[PDB]
RNA sequence: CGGAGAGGUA
DNA sequence: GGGTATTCGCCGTGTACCTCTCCTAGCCC
DNA sequence: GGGCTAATGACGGCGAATACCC
């Protein structure tokens, strides 16, 4: 990417490996120069934001071992756009049934 | 060609020759002060600008004018070396001609007195040293240059003002170089708002109003006229062909009386196209079309003159038969179009609540001065003053210059104030922006940011004292008497020299010159700083400053910048970048005539930059100037692109000019990942110098540059031949064509010995000539600190593998040999100063003394009788170095003081002990004590002793110079005595000052044996008051502050070794810990026996992506294999020649490298001294983007008698076998970094506690416990760690009474707790409380 | 302005509410260390457990007062150092890496004394720390009462935390060096030597490989 | 151990 | 009328360490 | 001597107070 992020046209034809022309190198400095000043950046942003997530779930504690709600969430295999991004497995792992699900049939 | 270079050639792989060598690298310091202090024939930056700017001063009252005439530099009282032994500042007094002009009173302008005080005292400016370097409190300050926006038109983008309609607004903002900025920002609604500096918005033509401007000229001045005839049926209108690009066809567009463009249509070009080619003059338009358009002024009736139709008001249907009805034929409607020129301004005048100037310049005044009841003049007052008064607005010569230029005016100067017609302008081209005729300027563009160096600062701020003490002196002559009274009697010297000493010293740009390698002060002074005063602010986010630009190329360097949170904003100035004369930055290109490369270079700017292309230093240069490739590489806007040859216009002078000093020292740059070798270049700054310098083996060249360049260098001022060496003088006897008329003898040059520069670290320059050897001038005659014969030694060669060796070596961390311990290398020197001051109390004055109350003799043993500890002795923490003692204000015991003094025996004294003990947890050697006492304090032993040693140095020097010149005049008297009769019998056997006893027959002899005695005693005297002169000022008293007799500085060395921990480095942005220094058997080895001194974890190159250490190692172990197989030609004694064949084989390997050939050297003696230097290793020089292929390093290995490969099969010293494969190993320059282990380390557990809380901080005797924040406080409440928070926040952090109770209970010898009530929360409750808000407790 | 504070109120917490019995040292790979130890200065385990230093001294005998055991502490002589082992051989210590972003940034290891200047880390825990031996400086910090070093040992011994908090699945697992030492034994060749050989078990595979 | 500014570190 | 649609202030700003300065002064009594 | 003694080149968010077409 160049300033404003949109891609050179000429990209970086050659390697470490082999010598690394001044604009190639000059061009790759804005990349390492906008990673740099983005982990600056996103490391006081997300510092920030654990420190009010912190402040507005402090008092959240387990206290209880049953309430005895069926009210629950349901849970389906994430198919986002037009294929599967997560399997229905992983987010019901761990969790604990609401009522007692049947086979398709 | 240099001497010092025939000692050690550096080979260098470079293949283009440098057509621009590298200029001094402090110019700009140098340049920046020089245009400051320098004299004037006109009125240019300096101090004659700020004096012709603020002066003459004119008074209330009396016509008594005080007139500047001249002003001169009074010479510094002291120089640079004894300025910063005595710990005041090196400034130069100023001093001013000026005469105090009373005119006649009452009459026509004449003078009736003119009275002169010349060289009027107003206060001393610190100078700077000829490094570039400002002495302030007896410390080297660096002025930071400052990158900010140029004084001018700025035409920005407002961007996320959607309000649910989105649209990207516009603004224009005028700044000034001094004065209040304006602002012309558009709206959602399309309305110009305008603001002066910040304040509140207001209507554009507000301002026109308050410029005495009626809505009619409003109107005229910046919308089209369009015409109305009133003739035919519903009114005729005069085609305007080019009136319709962006109109809508409303209505009925006729040509040669049909209609071409039906109502309704969207008018096209080929609607204009037909038009234009019709030439019609006139058309006939609906009625409803002329009521949609505004009149452009006001219209009255012919036969009474009553107003009818006015401006800024719409046309309709009764007011066109009201105008026709009383006569008229021309009307002048304002044109309108959404997309070109719109009614902005039509707008912004119905929205205008004034109609006048008087009102518009009292709503001004309010929104200036919220309340403060407004008169009419008044508000004329502010508002001629803030912009049309010289002494509140001005724009300087660069801010017109950028004013006209973004304008587009031919004019490259005007008036420092606004004008009329500039506001005009500025409407009418931001108008145009918004009808997109216009673009908007880049922002952080290097052609829109200027540099302030150290002068421009320090002209302004010193304009700001001189405009305070205008305002005294404005005050005086108006009070006092209007009659004769000399004008050193009301100008005080507390304003001027306060603001100019706040400026050098606490300013946010007046920067501690980070001084521990001479790359480190060279990065510093060249420093571009975007934060300061005027500028950025460092909590600005700022992704768009942060980022570099595509013309921040070749004139700050894009690979340095620090890592912290200010990235992106502090850069370095490239190498070979320099100021313009007006601030911006200029970078060399070689002129390219048709297709030849020239010589010749041109400083193109950065606007200047962009509108040719430039080739890149790549694509060599074959015959005379021709590139070799047909399409090469350029860039024409910042990106890069493929030009013809016969295209291009400039090209880039070197291939190190995109890079600073020391982004351009990283050999094979081009092979590291940009991140990584930024972070290496961030390290190299961080370099300690090492106790012994030595050359990098692989090295660019640039060593040499920064060397010289730097201030630690003792370079040959005139040349000749060295008469005396020493490790801290070196006495050259001077070339006779390099002699001032008369005699001048030697040059002394005395040597920096161990001086904290600025942080705890050692600079020491070290003697690297012998007796007779012949100088020329320019040339190192000492190495400074990190540097060996002339070059940079930032760090040392080491040998390394690169293999991960059982794993203490696993991230980045890093394995020593105990042999590197052994050689004493990576080893520091740290002087620590501590400063005892002996003050003033109102209880007495301390005193500096031997005899400290109630202490042990054990540590006054190294003490002496004047209370200033040895130069020499061994301390530890705890010991006393200055015995400092204050007066007691009175002896009051307490019973339980009684009882402790009754049992351990103490005594009881009227003075308390203050003395300065040296802190706990460093030792060392006392090397330096530097005694400061000002005029009235008498004189103690060390005092006196310092000054003798001061003394004899001086004296010695002067007595050099004394023994030259009188055994010059006696040579001279010598042979005229001879002559007028042979006497040279009796003079040898006499003492050779006894000759001027000694008389002779009358002649012309006689006489010359008179006037050469005369000139001998002349001689006698001179130096009798030039060593009183030198006693004055090393015994005159020294600056201090108020209350404090003397000040006592003493350094102490601590020889620091590196260990397991340490923060060890590369160039190249490798880094690491030192794991742990295992003995030396243990270390690898190979089938020569050889160990291994460094082994570096591989796996850090797959990833961090800095594989130029690998061919660092690679060409490292090329060169040192040079250097062996040497060094054995060296132990077997071969011939010369042998060795000189196999140097100018080593030089000579390559294709297309500039490196010339020998002999050209001398045949033994040089050869030999080469030799005796290559023996460690061979110098190889590699330009960053022109370095050695992979080919030159595999044949330099060939001809080392070395895997070709790069890998030998090392052999596992640990244990003592092969492993499956070779691993790479060679020589890398590795950089001991200033983050010691020793420095970092700490804990603590019972200590220092604050007086306002219990938490635990002071010093560094023993520092506070470490700050256990809330975020570790999350992350134990993550865990059930629910009792440890309580422990560590409640009886390990503030209950005193937890704190004593389980300190008792653990030292009891169990390990429980008192639940406890913070003190921090008590504070936190106390404060609530004090503010008339009650807190209180629910009690169980 | 001061009961105001950024970040948090400053001394109940933040900024900086800062700890006795507690220290900072850049860290060292140490790769002989068992999973729940960690390597640390012998200078820093003296003059952090000084009163623990002074209760055994005082308890032993060796001591008469807190005066002597002051002196004996600073001598720093060999009878002090057995001491201190006895004080440090189950006592554990939490390791703290500066920016905190999760629990596993705070962790509980077994001290072990070295001899040197900075502290060891175990290699498998500095993914955990989200600490790369690149000069990064740690903070240990020294639980006192039963209950402290009872419930670090329960929950915040890295043995404990083999488990992310976060999504499940391990985070301390081999990163690059153990790694690729591993990934070099189990690859496999067509012809080398003792090939095609019958062996009974890693007994003299181990002999005939070394 | 009362508080600001600067650099470097992670 | 009313709902934007501005304009007017308040406010927030990762972490922790090291080093370094640099510290109410004017003034009419 | 001294005892009183007196600015924007931030940015994004947000609540409060009016501002403006239909």
């Avoid at chain 2, 005395?750 to 020329?776: A, F, H």
């Avoid at chain 2, 030694?793 to 696993?810: D, E, I, S």
């Avoid at chain 2, 005796?1172 to 080392?1200: C, H, S």
């Amino acid at each position: 990417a160049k300033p404003d992020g949109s891609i050179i046209e000429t990209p970086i034809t050659a390697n470490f490996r082999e010598g690394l022309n001044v604009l190639q190198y000059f061009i790759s400095t804005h990349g390492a120069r906008k990673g740099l000043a983005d982990t600056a950046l996103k490391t006081a942003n997300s510092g920030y934001l654990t420190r009010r997530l912190v402040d507005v779930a402090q008092d959240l504690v387990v206290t209880e071992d049953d309430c005895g709600t069926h009210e629950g969430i349901m849970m389906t295999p994430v198919i986002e756009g037009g294929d599967v991004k997560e399997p229905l497995r992983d987010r019901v792992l761990g969790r604990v049934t609401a009522e007692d699900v049947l086979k398709p049939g | 060609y240099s001497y010092t270079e025939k000692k050690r050639i550096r080979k260098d792989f470079g293949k283009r020759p440098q057509v621009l060598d590298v200029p001094y690298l402090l110019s700009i310091q140098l340049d920046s002060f020089q245009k400051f202090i320098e004299q004037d024939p006109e009125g240019q930056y300096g101090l004659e600008a700020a004096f012709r700017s603020v002066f003459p001063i004119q008074s209330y009252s009396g016509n008594s004018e005080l007139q500047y005439v001249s002003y001169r530099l009074g010479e510094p009282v002291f120089d640079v070396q004894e300025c910063q032994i005595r710990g005041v500042t090196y400034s130069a007094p100023l001093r001013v001609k000026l005469r105090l002009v009373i005119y006649e009173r009452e009459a026509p302008e004449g003078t009736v007195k003119d009275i002169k005080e010349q060289e009027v005292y107003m206060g001393e400016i610190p100078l700077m040293t000829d490094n570039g370097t400002f002495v302030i409190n007896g410390t080297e300050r660096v002025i930071v240059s400052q990158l900010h926006r140029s004084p001018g038109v700025f035409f920005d983008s407002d961007k996320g003002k959607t309000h649910s309609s989105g649209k990207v607004l516009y603004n224009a903002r005028i700044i000034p170089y001094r004065g209040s900025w304006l602002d012309f920002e558009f709206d959602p609604k399309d309305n110009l708002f305008v603001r002066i500096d910040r304040r509140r918005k207001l209507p554009a033509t507000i301002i026109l109003r308050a410029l005495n401007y009626t809505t009619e000229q409003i109107l005229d001045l910046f919308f089209e006229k369009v015409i109305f005839e009133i003739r035919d049926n519903k009114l005729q209108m005069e085609l305007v062909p080019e009136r319709l690009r962006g109109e809508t066809a409303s209505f009925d567009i006729e040509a040669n009386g049909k209609v071409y463009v039906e109502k309704g249509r969207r008018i096209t070009a080929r609607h204009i196209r037909q038009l234009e080619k019709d030439d019609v003059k006139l058309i006939e338009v609906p009625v409803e079309y002329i009521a949609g358009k505004v009149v452009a002024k006001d219209y009255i009736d012919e036969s009474t003159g009553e107003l009818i139709c006015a401006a800024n008001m719409e046309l309709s249907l009764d007011l066109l038969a009201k105008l026709s009805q009383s006569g008229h034929k021309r009307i002048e409607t304002l044109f309108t179009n959404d997309l070109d020129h719109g009614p902005y301004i039509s707008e912004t005048l119905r929205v205008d609540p004034t109609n006048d100037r008087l009102s518009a310049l009292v709503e001004i005044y309010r929104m200036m001065r919220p309340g403060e009841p407004p008169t009419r003049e008044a508000a004329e007052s502010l508002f001629e003053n803030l912009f049309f008064s010289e002494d509140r607005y001005d724009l300087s010569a660069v801010g017109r210059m950028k004013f006209n230029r973004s304008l587009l005016r031919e004019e490259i100067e005007g008036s420092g104030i606004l004008s009329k017609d500039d506001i005009i302008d500025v409407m009418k081209k931001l108008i145009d922006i918004r009808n997109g005729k216009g673009e908007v300027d880049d922002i952080d563009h290097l052609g829109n940011r200027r540099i302030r160096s150290v002068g421009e600062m320090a002209e302004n701020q010193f304009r700001v004292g001189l405009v305070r003490v205008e305002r005294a002196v404005k005050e005086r002559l108006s009070l006092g008497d209007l009659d004769t009274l000399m004008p050193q009697d009301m100008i005080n010297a507390k304003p001027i020299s306060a603001a100019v000493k706040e400026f050098f010293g606490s300013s946010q740009l007046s920067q501690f010159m980070d001084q521990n390698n001479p790359l480190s002060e060279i990065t510093h002074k060249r420093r571009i700083s975007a934060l300061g005063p005027g500028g950025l602010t460092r909590e600005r986010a700022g992704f768009e400053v942060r980022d570099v630009h595509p013309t921040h190329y070749g004139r700050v360097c894009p690979i340095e910048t620090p890592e912290g949170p200010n990235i992106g904003l502090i850069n370095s100035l490239s190498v070979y970048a320099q100021t313009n004369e007006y601030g911006f930055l200029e970078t060399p290109y070689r002129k390219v005539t048709d297709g030849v490369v020239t010589d010749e270079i041109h400083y193109l700017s950065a606007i200047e930059e962009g509108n040719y292309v430039i080739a890149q230093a790549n694509s060599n240069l074959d015959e005379e100037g021709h590139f070799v490739e047909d399409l090469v590489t350029c860039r024409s806007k910042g990106e890069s692109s493929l030009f013809s040859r016969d295209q291009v216009d400039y090209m880039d002078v070197s291939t190190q000019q995109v890079v600073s000093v020391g982004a351009s020292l990283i050999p094979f740059l081009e092979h590291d990942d940009a991140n990584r070798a930024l972070m290496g270049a961030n390290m190299q700054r961080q370099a300690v110098p090492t106790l012994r310098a030595d050359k990098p083996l692989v090295g660019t060249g640039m060593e040499r540059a920064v060397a010289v360049d730097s201030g630690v260098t003792a370079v040959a001022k005139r040349g000749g031949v060295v008469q005396y060496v020493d490790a801290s003088r070196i006495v050259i006897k001077v070339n006779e064509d390099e002699m001032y008329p008369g005699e001048a003898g030697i040059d002394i040059y005395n040597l920096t010995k161990y001086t904290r520069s600025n942080q705890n670290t050692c600079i020491n320059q070290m003697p690297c000539v012998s007796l007779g050897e012949p100088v020329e001038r320019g040339d190192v005659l000492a190495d400074g600190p990190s540097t060996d014969l002339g070059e940079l030694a930032l760090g040392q060669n080491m040998r390394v593998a690169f293999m991960p060796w059982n794993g203490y070596n696993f991230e980045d961390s890093i394995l020593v040999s105990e042999r590197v311990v052994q050689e004493d290398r990576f080893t520091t020197i740290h002087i620590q100063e501590l400063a005892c001051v002996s003050r003033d109390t109102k209880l007495g004055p301390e005193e500096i003394t031997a005899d400290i109350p109630n202490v042990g003799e054990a540590a006054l043993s190294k003490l002496d009788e004047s209370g200033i500890v040895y130069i020499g002795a061994e301390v530890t923490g705890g010991d006393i170095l200055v015995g400092k003692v204050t007066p007691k204000g009175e002896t009051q015991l307490t019973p339980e003081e009684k009882l402790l003094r009754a049992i351990f025996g103490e005594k009881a004294s009227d003075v308390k002990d203050s003395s300065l003990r040296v802190p706990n947890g460093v030792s060392g050697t006392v090397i330096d004590v530097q005694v400061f006492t000002r005029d009235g304090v008498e004189k103690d032993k060390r005092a006196l002793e310092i000054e003798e040693m001061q003394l004899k140095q001086a004296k010695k020097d002067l007595s050099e110079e004394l023994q030259i010149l009188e055994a010059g005049l006696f040579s001279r008297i010598r042979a005229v005595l001879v002559a007028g009769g042979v006497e040279a019998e009796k003079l040898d056997k006499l003492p050779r000052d006894r000759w001027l006893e000694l008389g002779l027959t009358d002649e012309e002899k006689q006489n010359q044996l008179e006037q050469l005695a005369e000139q001998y005693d002349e001689l006698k005297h001179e130096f009798e008051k030039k060593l009183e002169a030198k006693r004055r000022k090393i015994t005159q008293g020294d600056d201090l502050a108020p209350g404090v007799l003397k000040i006592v500085k003493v350094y102490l060395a601590v020889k620091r070794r590196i260990q397991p921990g340490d923060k060890m480095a590369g160039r190249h942005g490798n880094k690491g810990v030192i794991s742990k220094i295992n003995p030396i058997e243990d270390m690898p080895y190979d089938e020569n026996g050889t160990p291994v001194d460094i082994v570096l974890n591989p796996l850090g190159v797959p990833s961090r992506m800095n594989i130029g250490q690998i061919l660092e190692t690679h060409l490292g172990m090329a060169a040192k294999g040079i250097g062996d197989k040497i060094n054995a030609m060296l132990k077997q004694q071969q011939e010369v020649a042998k060795l000189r064949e196999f140097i100018q084989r080593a030089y000579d390997l390559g294709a297309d490298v500039r490196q010339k050939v020998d002999l050209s050297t001398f045949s033994d003696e040089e050869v030999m001294r080469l030799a005796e230097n290559l023996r460690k290793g061979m110098p190889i020089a590699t330009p960053v983007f022109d370095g050695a292929k992979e080919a030159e390093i595999k044949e330099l290995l060939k001809l080392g008698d070395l895997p070709t490969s790069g890998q030998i099969r090392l052999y596992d010293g640990r244990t003592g076998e092969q492993f499956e494969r070779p691993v790479t190993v060679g020589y890398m320059y590795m950089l001991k970094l200033n983050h010691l282990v020793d420095d970092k380390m700490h804990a603590r557990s019972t200590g220092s506690y604050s007086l306002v809380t219990q938490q635990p901080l002071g010093g560094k005797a023993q520092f506070g416990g470490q700050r256990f924040g809330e975020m570790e406080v999350w992350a134990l409440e993550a865990y059930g760690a629910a009792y440890t928070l309580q422990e560590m926040l409640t009886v390990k952090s503030d209950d005193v009474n937890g704190r004593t109770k389980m300190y008792k209970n653990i030292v009891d010898g169990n390990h429980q707790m008192e639940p406890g009530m913070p003190e921090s929360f008590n504070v936190l409750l106390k404060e609530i409380r004090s503010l008339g808000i009650n807190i209180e407790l629910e009690d169980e | 302005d001061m009961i105001k504070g950024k970040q948090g109120r400053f001394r109940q917490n933040l900024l900086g509410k800062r700890v006795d019995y507690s220290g900072r040292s850049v860290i060292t790979v140490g790769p002989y260390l068992r999973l729940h130890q960690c390597g640390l200065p012998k200078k820093m385990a003296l003059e952090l457990f000084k009163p623990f230093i002074y209760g055994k001294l005082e308890l032993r005998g060796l001591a008469t007062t807190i005066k002597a055991a002051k002196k004996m502490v600073e001598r720093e002589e060999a009878v002090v150092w057995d001491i201190l082992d006895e004080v440090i051989r189950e006592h554990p210590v939490l390791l703290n890496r500066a920016p905190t972003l999760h629990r596993l940034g705070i962790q509980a290891f077994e001290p072990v004394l070295i001899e040197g200047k900075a502290i060891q880390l175990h290699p498998l825990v500095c993914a955990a720390y989200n600490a790369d031996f690149d000069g990064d400086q740690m903070a240990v910090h020294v639980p006192l009462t039963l209950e402290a070093q009872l419930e670090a040992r329960a929950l915040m011994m890295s043995t404990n935390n083999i488990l992310s908090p976060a999504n499940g699945e391990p985070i301390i697992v081999p990163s690059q060096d153990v790694v690729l030492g591993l990934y070099y034994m189990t690859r496999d060749c067509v012809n080398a030597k003792g090939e095609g050989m019958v062996l009974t078990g890693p007994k003299e595979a181990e002999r005939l490989y070394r």
